[PDB]
Amino acid sequence: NIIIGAMTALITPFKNGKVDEQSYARLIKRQIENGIDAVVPVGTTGESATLTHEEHRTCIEIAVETCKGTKVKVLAGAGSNATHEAVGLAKFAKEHGADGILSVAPYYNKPTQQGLYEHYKAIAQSVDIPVLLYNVPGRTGCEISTDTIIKLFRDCENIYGVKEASGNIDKCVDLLAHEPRMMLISGEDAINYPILSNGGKGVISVTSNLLPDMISALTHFALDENYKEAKKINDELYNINKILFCESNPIPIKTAMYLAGLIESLEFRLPLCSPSKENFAKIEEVMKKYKIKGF
Amino acid sequence: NIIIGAMTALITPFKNGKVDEQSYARLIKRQIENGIDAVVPVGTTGESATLTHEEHRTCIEIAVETCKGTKVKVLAGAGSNATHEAVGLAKFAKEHGADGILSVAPYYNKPTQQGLYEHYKAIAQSVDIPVLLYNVPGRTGCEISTDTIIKLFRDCENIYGVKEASGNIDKCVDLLAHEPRMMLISGEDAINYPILSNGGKGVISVTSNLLPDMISALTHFALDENYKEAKKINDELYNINKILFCESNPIPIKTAMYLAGLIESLEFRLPLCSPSKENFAKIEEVMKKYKIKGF
Amino acid sequence: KNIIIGAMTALITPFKNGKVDEQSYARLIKRQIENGIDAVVPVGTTGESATLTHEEHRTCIEIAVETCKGTKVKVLAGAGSNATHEAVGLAKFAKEHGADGILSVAPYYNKPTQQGLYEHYKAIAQSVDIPVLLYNVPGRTGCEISTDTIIKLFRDCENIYGVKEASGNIDKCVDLLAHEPRMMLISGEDAINYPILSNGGKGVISVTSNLLPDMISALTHFALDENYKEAKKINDELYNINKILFCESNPIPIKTAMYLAGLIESLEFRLPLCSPSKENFAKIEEVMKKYKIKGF
Amino acid sequence: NIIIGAMTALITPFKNGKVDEQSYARLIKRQIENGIDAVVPVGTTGESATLTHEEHRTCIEIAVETCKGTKVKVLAGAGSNATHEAVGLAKFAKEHGADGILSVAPYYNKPTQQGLYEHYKAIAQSVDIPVLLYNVPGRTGCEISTDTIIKLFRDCENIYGVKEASGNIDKCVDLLAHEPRMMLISGEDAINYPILSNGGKGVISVTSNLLPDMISALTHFALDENYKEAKKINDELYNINKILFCESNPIPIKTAMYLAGLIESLEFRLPLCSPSKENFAKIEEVMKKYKIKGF
Numbered sequence A, B, D: 001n002i003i004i005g006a007m008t009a010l011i012t013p014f015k016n017g018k019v020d021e022q023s024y025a026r027l028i029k030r031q032i033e034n035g036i037d038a039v040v041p042v043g044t045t046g047e048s049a050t051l052t053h054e055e056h057r058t059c060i061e062i063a064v065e066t067c068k069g070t071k072v073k074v075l076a077g078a079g080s081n082a083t084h085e086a087v088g089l090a091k092f093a094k095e096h097g098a099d100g101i102l103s104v105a106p107y108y109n110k111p112t113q114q115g116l117y118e119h120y121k122a123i124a125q126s127v128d129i130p131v132l133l134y135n136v137p138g139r140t141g142c143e144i145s146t147d148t149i150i151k152l153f154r155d156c157e158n159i160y161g162v163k164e165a166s167g168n169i170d171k172c173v174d175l176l177a178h179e180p181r182m183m184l185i186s187g188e189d190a191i192n193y194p195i196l197s198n199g200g201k202g203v204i205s206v207t208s209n210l211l212p213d214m215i216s217a218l219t220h221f222a223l224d225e226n227y228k229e230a231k232k233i234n235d236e237l238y239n240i241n242k243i244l245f246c247e248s249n250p251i252p253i254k255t256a257m258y259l260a261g262l263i264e265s266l267e268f269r270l271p272l273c274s275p276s277k278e279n280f281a282k283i284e285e286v287m288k289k290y291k292i293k294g295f
Numbered sequence C: 001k002n003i004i005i006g007a008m009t010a011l012i013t014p015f016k017n018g019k020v021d022e023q024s025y026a027r028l029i030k031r032q033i034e035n036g037i038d039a040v041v042p043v044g045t046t047g048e049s050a051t052l053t054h055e056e057h058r059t060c061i062e063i064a065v066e067t068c069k070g071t072k073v074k075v076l077a078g079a080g081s082n083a084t085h086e087a088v089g090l091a092k093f094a095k096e097h098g099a100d101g102i103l104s105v106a107p108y109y110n111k112p113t114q115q116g117l118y119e120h121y122k123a124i125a126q127s128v129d130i131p132v133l134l135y136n137v138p139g140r141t142g143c144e145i146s147t148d149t150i151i152k153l154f155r156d157c158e159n160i161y162g163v164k165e166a167s168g169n170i171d172k173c174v175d176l177l178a179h180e181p182r183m184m185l186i187s188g189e190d191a192i193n194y195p196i197l198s199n200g201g202k203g204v205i206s207v208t209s210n211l212l213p214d215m216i217s218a219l220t221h222f223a224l225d226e227n228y229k230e231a232k233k234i235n236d237e238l239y240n241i242n243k244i245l246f247c248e249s250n251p252i253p254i255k256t257a258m259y260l261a262g263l264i265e266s267l268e269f270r271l272p273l274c275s276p277s278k279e280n281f282a283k284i285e286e287v288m289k290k291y292k293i294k295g296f
């Protein structure tokens, strides 16, 4: 059981410091109507760090409910650097109708490979829905090694692949060569096409928040082996794909969504904050080059 | 007001998955009686990541109370990657008698330097006790730049320095060359001496959990500029210091405390776990060279 | 621009008793020619450019040029140096001795600024009228030719026609061709031949092709023909050898493989290069068993 | 047999593209008259890369000749990424009266530890003068492991230590902890003091080209255990120490020597070239803070 294809790491819109739940539902519906295959509530892009556990839960529920009666899957953000917390989130997602969970490598405490293994095993054994690993060492301070990922995929029935955001093409090659059953998911927008053309089966995208049609089309073109068309969109997207990381994600994507009139308010929770006026200008300029779907 | 000198990042003993509160109190007593100037409850070494906010709060209470009627100060771990969580921990520490707080840079969500400034300013403005910044980019995925550290030190009266755990002596020179009024504290036992010998004013040690008398002496000898004697102790500590990081802290230190009979069970919270058998054996071997004080 | 693209081999330089084995070298090149290779690269990194003297370097270029004469196979001569006066000297030699083009690695060790890189390659490009392919390998040189610098050189210098990327940076490969799709992007790492080719790259300068020229050539031409199913088939078959051929710094594993296959007489390097560990030696030997290795 | 103390990695002046041999001798005399213990002709700082073998040998001879009768030693730059070239240079230097050689780790071709061991062994066995290893992975793309350095020091009588330029204080601790008989030499001006206060026995300096009296003083104050003074100079020197690397060495140091009127023209050999105007401005600005000795 797997979750693949074009997916969106949903931004979490705030209004006066709280999640704007109507806005959230509306943004999710906008994803659905633009051909997206799955949404990821409360990943990194959704400011998982600054949402309380109960708000985190509410967002997951809104995604499930908004996606009900549609083919769009909900891959709920359920990671934590504490296994008991990650287990709690995983169980909740399962109990509340999520289709799978995305579970980021523990940040800050730098577990050993053995610890990572037990972390994810405890999580995968706690629910019967697909678990996607999520490697992003630049943020977590640790890496799930290729051996650990493969071992987890083989030992745990529900662990089905990994979202890679380690900027390491070679590891991606290794993963699929040793374990071609696993689903490699691009966590790096700029190289969506190369990852897909090289055996990856989906993306969890930041850019698709703004340009869901473009990211969905890219992903589907590639899965269909229409590489020319997929490369073409990837090339077109390169500028925005890079600019959306001029400051730590999701600062730029939220800024663009606001500039586009897709969210009412440009609000973060500290320590995240508005970009510098210079990057605000930079984001505004790149944005003009693209056609941005409305509601 | 400041909190400097020899300081111990207290490990957090678990018994059957719960904080062993009597053991915790006993360990702190032991530190007090071995010349330590301050104890740091629930820092990284205390597994801040896997304690609930309640357990976290309980550990701060145990420390404050245990140190009552002594010279020994409590520098409460109060960091978080969410500013609202960090403010609550700071306020709690203040309201419950902690002498100051240690506040680690936001991990995982990678805030901008502007975000780090606002994060720490909000924390500093919420309490009137001393605030020590804490820089450990290997763990957080971000660095508080020297400029940001200095601006915060200057702009906020209660922010009085930084614990550096970045293994970057160039930066330590940079901080004190440009702003020698701040209290630079070593957050890595391996370079306590380099930092102390460059005008650092203390340590927040891991090694001092096992050898509080050695770390204390080392620190006071250096503070007295008796570098002959300081380096003498530091050279003696080389082996233990090195082995206490063969796996991510606090895996080795807890393993050592257990071998030394100072804690009842070798228990961690996932994703942390016991060291490899090989490292367990190495740690045990290294400890033989040292005189480990009991209670 | 005139170009040199397609399937290319970064020729090993065989030594016997510490000296260049010129007969073996020529024989190895003829084998490449007979296996569908589009061009050969004498005295690149894989050919131990660093430890050949200037006169040996030049002999190897001459042997490659003369051996390829009367065939379709082009010679893209190694002519890089971290000293511009040496690089220009090698470039002029290559040009005057009939090489079809040159490959010129970014200056290593002295870490020039981007302006310096631009001046370095501009001087090289002005000194000859043959194609120049830039060569970026920051892991080795301690410097990177920025995407901006590459594109500027490509556009400003008539004969600079592309770059061999050996950086394991697919993002950079997208950057290059997204902004300047006229340039020839050439893979300089076998492990990412396919990623680069499938992104519009126009060739490879291969280590693996020393041992398996027929496979690398077919892989490249399938991909160039947009026959991605067949190209992928081959690339997948190649995984094991590609991986093991970098268990130690290239060309330590490739020469070991060439020796084990009886294609070179002695397993000899010039220091500081040396034999792989016995364990890696054994691993290489095992991995080769799975492959059909063409003889002479 | 060892070469330690305050040493200078000499710049090589050009005039109309040729080595300015008179200027070179003059600069060497200036070092000698300012308390320097040894000079290093044709290291990285002396643009080893772009000198011919014949020019490289000429510079070595000039250094030996100018130092003759003085007690100042010549630690000749004899490094190469080709063992036969490094041997050639080593032999030339021994035969022409150099006191020892500095031999950088092979750059570009990334030899294995075994290869590095054999490289250095061949060099050490080619001559009977002291050989100092030189680790600068940022420039070479390889590292001489701690283990390899210790083996070489132990196995070869004339290999007496290493100049470290890897900004890794921890390795410096490891090296002296396992092998306290070796001479650790600072190849990183900004942290000369920390290295010396932690067991180092000398510096091979870029800054000393410009401020030989201050580098000499700092080194000797430290070797005589006057850490207060040594640190003082180190702190003062921080700005020039840092600005001297705003662009790749020796671009900034040559710019500064020219600004000080110590060389006739700001000339490099490509691919090195003049710094940017902005950086020129920065260097000129920082220099005003210092009293620069003339001839």
Ligand SMILES: N[C@@H](CCCC[NH3+])C(=O)O
Binding pocket: A048, A049, A050, A051, A052, A053, A056, A080, A081, B080, B081, B082, B085, B108
């Ligand atoms: N800020 C903490 C708790 C978040 C819990 C709810 N998502 C963390 O990032 O792990």
Ligand SMILES: N[C@@H](CCCC[NH3+])C(=O)O
Binding pocket: A080, A081, A082, A085, B048, B049, B050, B051, B052, B053, B056, B080, B081
């Ligand atoms: N695991 C979360 C929650 C910590 C709760 C307070 N100790 C974090 O590390 O931020």
Ligand SMILES: N[C@@H](CCCC[NH3+])C(=O)O
Binding pocket: C049, C050, C051, C052, C053, C054, C057, C081, C082, D080, D081, D082, D085, D108
């Ligand atoms: N070993 C030197 C000289 C090479 C001579 C020509 N191959 C270098 O790597 O640049």
Ligand SMILES: N[C@@H](CCCC[NH3+])C(=O)O
Binding pocket: C081, C082, C083, C086, C109, D048, D049, D050, D051, D052, D053, D056, D080, D081
């Ligand atoms: N440029 C070559 C040759 C140097 C010749 C001796 N100084 C190198 O850096 O190795």
